């Protein structure tokens, strides 16, 4: 049992009032250049925000002018430190052995929707990175392709529906061809 | 604004009053790692899979909660008890896998543009109310510091079943009905 560490929120000196703390680690290229950002919010106004690239706490609206000075004194140590002790340690010890190591296998299926329309229905994947083409007889069809946005079902999956507008002659070879990278080999589905 | 491969929202307290409402949740690229339930004082992992390997000590949601109360204290005065402006949630209903008779699926109700973090999200089957096999998320942050929230329905498609997703939220005059049919 390796422990997950929280970023610390720092204290102070029929109508509803609302306060948010958003601590946020920005990774790029491994842990090669981490960026720490803490923001403090009244209702929706962001009033005071530490950001590692600036390196101190700053006000963001007039409502945080007094807040700035105080935090810079009582935290700021420990807050510069957080990047190196729970932006990093979080990533290099709990993200590596979990999220950065989820693959979830996709899930391709075709069907006639209503000259009709064919719906390639690519479900259940993770990561979000995915490619989905329409081959009617061996070559790729550009026109009559209308995809959705990349739905996010928020259980750590995805889905996307690619749509081909067509008209069935004879019996023809239709192909939803699908590249993820939980797939070493491209799923390719056949239709009538 | 703001280039990166991965985003860890680690520590995300939210407190709103009156009524004492709080919510401590971590995220990774947009999906709920876990929330701390505040009565019982226990981490609650989104996919219990994540519960076997790593632990989060829950008292640390409590700490971030405590300071988040305090600064509400201070700020609410400071702003001249400017109170928050009630937003209209939007709903879209969709299904996880394509729809096929007799095979079980999941109905999804996703609500975005929530503010405040109080909403009511419920399910209708031919307009009689449903609770069994419902799961609902945490509040999930956005950019403009709203929230979005989704609830899930266990069904088994059929005919003619008619499915409504219903939203109650103070920003709405009258409950919104989200209507869906296979």
């Amino acid at each position, epitope marked *: 049992l390796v422990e997950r560490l929280y970023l610390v929120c720092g204290g102070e000196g029929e109508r509803h009032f609302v306060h948010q703390f958003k601590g946020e680690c920005y990774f790029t290229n491994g842990t090669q250049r981490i960026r720490l950002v803490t923001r403090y919010i009244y209702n929706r106004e962001e009033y005071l925000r530490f950001d590692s690239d600036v390196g101190e706490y700053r006000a963001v609206t007039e409502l945080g002018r007094h807040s700035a000075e105080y935090y810079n004194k009582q935290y700021l140590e420990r807050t510069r430190a957080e990047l190196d002790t729970a932006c990093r340690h979080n990533y290099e010890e709990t993200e590596v052995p979990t999220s950065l190591r989820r693959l979830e296998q996709p899930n391709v299926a075709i069907s006639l929707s209503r000259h009709n329309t064919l719906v390639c229905s690519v479900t259940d994947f993770y990561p979000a990175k995915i490619k989905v083409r329409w081959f009617r007889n061996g070559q790729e069809e550009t026109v009559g392709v209308s995809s959705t946005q990349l739905i996010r079902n928020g259980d750590w999956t995805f889905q996307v529906l690619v749509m081909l507008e067509m008209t069935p002659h004879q019996g023809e070879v239709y192909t939803c061809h699908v590249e993820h990278p939980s797939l070493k080999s491209p799923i390719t589905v056949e239709w009538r | 604004d703001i280039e990166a491969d991965h985003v860890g929202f680690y520590g995300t307290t939210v407190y709103q009053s009156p009524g004492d409402i709080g919510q401590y949740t971590h995220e990774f690229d947009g999906d709920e790692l876990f929330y701390v339930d505040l009565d019982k004082k226990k981490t609650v992992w989104r996919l219990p899979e994540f519960g076997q390997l790593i632990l989060f000590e829950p008292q640390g949601g409590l700490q971030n909660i405590a300071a988040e109360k*305090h600064n509400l204290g201070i700020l609410t005065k400071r702003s001249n008890f400017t109170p928050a402006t009630n937003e209209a949630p939007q709903a879209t209903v969709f299904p996880k896998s394509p729809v096929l008779l007799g095979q079980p699926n999941t109905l999804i109700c996703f609500v975005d543009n929530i503010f405040p973090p109080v909403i009511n999200i419920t399910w209708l089957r031919n307009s009689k109310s449903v609770t069994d096999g419902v799961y609902e998320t945490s509040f999930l942050v956005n950019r403009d510091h709203s929230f979005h929230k989704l609830s899930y329905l266990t069904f088994i498609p059929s005919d003619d079943d008619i499915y409504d997703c219903k939203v109650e939220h103070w920003g709405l005059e009258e409950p919104v009905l989200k209507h869906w049919e296979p």
Partner: T-cell receptor
Amino acid sequence: EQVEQLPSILRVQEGSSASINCSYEDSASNYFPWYKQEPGENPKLIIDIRSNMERKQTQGLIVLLDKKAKRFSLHITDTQPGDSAMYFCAASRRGSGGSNYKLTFGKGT
Amino acid sequence: AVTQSPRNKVAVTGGKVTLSCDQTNNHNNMYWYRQDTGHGLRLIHYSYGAGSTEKGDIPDGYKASRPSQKEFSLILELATPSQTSVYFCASGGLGGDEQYFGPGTRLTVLE
């Protein structure tokens, strides 16, 4: 198991340097600081360090950490009687936490 | 700041003792330490909030209570000569780091 202080009792000539060792479990801990209980008084904080670095030196006060050794320690220059206090060594999982949330405190000097 | 009444009590074996604290820092977590020469700075009980009280290092004969943010009270149900020591209070929180200790409390039991 947790933290051992040392030295237990210590003398020093008025004008010499003075040093307190420490070690931990704990495992890595990210908060290790110091406390000066004045004769017949409360403990008040003097200096701290996290695993972020290994050397802090602040207004006549010298603190060192070796993380991998599970080892840190405290030094002063050109002493007086004014720095004759019961000094207190503690260490803790910076936060989050926890069981080993905060402090601890070794036996004392 | 912190304070604490009593600042010195003298007790009677088989009595009830109560030492209050009352921090005013709006702080989250409070702790009762006992400082005895030889044995250091030992932790009796503590808390993370108004309501709950957790066992510390040396909670034998020490039943501890905390009714609110401000107040944290150490209770010695039944006195004995060995309960005799100094006693300290300290608060910290929202959100640290730095334990703020109380002025002190010198107790004495007798047979």
